[PDB]
Amino acid sequence: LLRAHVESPLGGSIVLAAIVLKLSLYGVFRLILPILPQASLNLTYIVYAIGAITVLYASFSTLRTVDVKELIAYSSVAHAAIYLMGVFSNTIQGLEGAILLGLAHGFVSSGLFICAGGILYDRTGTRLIYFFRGLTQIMPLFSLFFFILCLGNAGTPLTLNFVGEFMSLYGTLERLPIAGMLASTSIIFSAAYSIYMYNRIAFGGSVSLYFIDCFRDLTKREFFILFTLVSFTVILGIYPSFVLDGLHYNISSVVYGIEPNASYLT
């Protein structure tokens, strides 16, 4: 992923991170939950150790990644760890939160790949972070959408990313508390690499002295693909019922377990 999601053309990257990562998640709801319930419950601690390790290791390496597209690619790894832990929670809110996070990741990673692999890359021909600084001064429209996208990546409330992270994290916590507590540290570290990357590119001084020419701001095309993606994350972050209402009944069918006075009615 750190190779393919970076070397891909921009349209390839959007498809690869927005839809192709979601295949393994939808695959869990068809291939593990209904037919391997006993193995899934008995092995959740192995799944959770891997998911917990992935959340910390990917977060720390994202903080030290100097290719802008590679940094957005590595944050996908950290977010996918949370939906993977939510999908093995065997709780309604963890399972719905996993689907919610998967969807919210698709809008946010699409927007951040457009910002890096399509706006910065087309203008400079480079993907190295060392050459960017203070872009807000000359590109206010880019910095406005880039910031909102970086809040989505940090799971800021009013994005669908907070709703999915919260529900996924609650289910992971309730299934296995130590794994949820470590996974919760993502609320600190996703903010760290999102805010760090935003500050170094949009803020952090005047416009970079490596730019010989001045840069134009977003073209109408760039504006309206970012605006559309930002629209979906915010509207669904305020009314996530638009997806949850169509999720509740079917997602009930993949839960495994019983209550003592609720089961075996006569």
């Binding site: 601690y45 100097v66 203008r123 400079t124 050459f131 296995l176 490596y210």
Partner: protein, 75 residues
């Protein structure tokens, strides 16, 4: 240089050379006492520790509707 014409950038050779070293560093990894110890610590020890802790506390606690006169412990 990459399809569409981009803006003129003062591409600093030192920074470009640093970027090339990072892309090619995998070609020069070697097993040493230091690298083996670090790799073993990150890949085996820490994950197996979380795995052991997750194993031993699986099913230990439940909070739902626990009142005074009850225990969080289930096991």
């Amino acid at each position: 240089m990459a399809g569409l014409q981009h803006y003129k950038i003062a591409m600093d050779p030192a920074l470009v050379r640093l970027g090339s070293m990072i892309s090619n560093r995998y070609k020069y990894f070697r097993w040493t006492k230091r690298t083996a110890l670090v790799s073993f610590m990150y890949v085996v020890v820490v994950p197996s520790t979380i795995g052991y802790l997750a194993y031993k506390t699986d099913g230990l606690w439940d909070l739902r509707a626990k009142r005074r006169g009850d225990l969080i412990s289930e096991r």
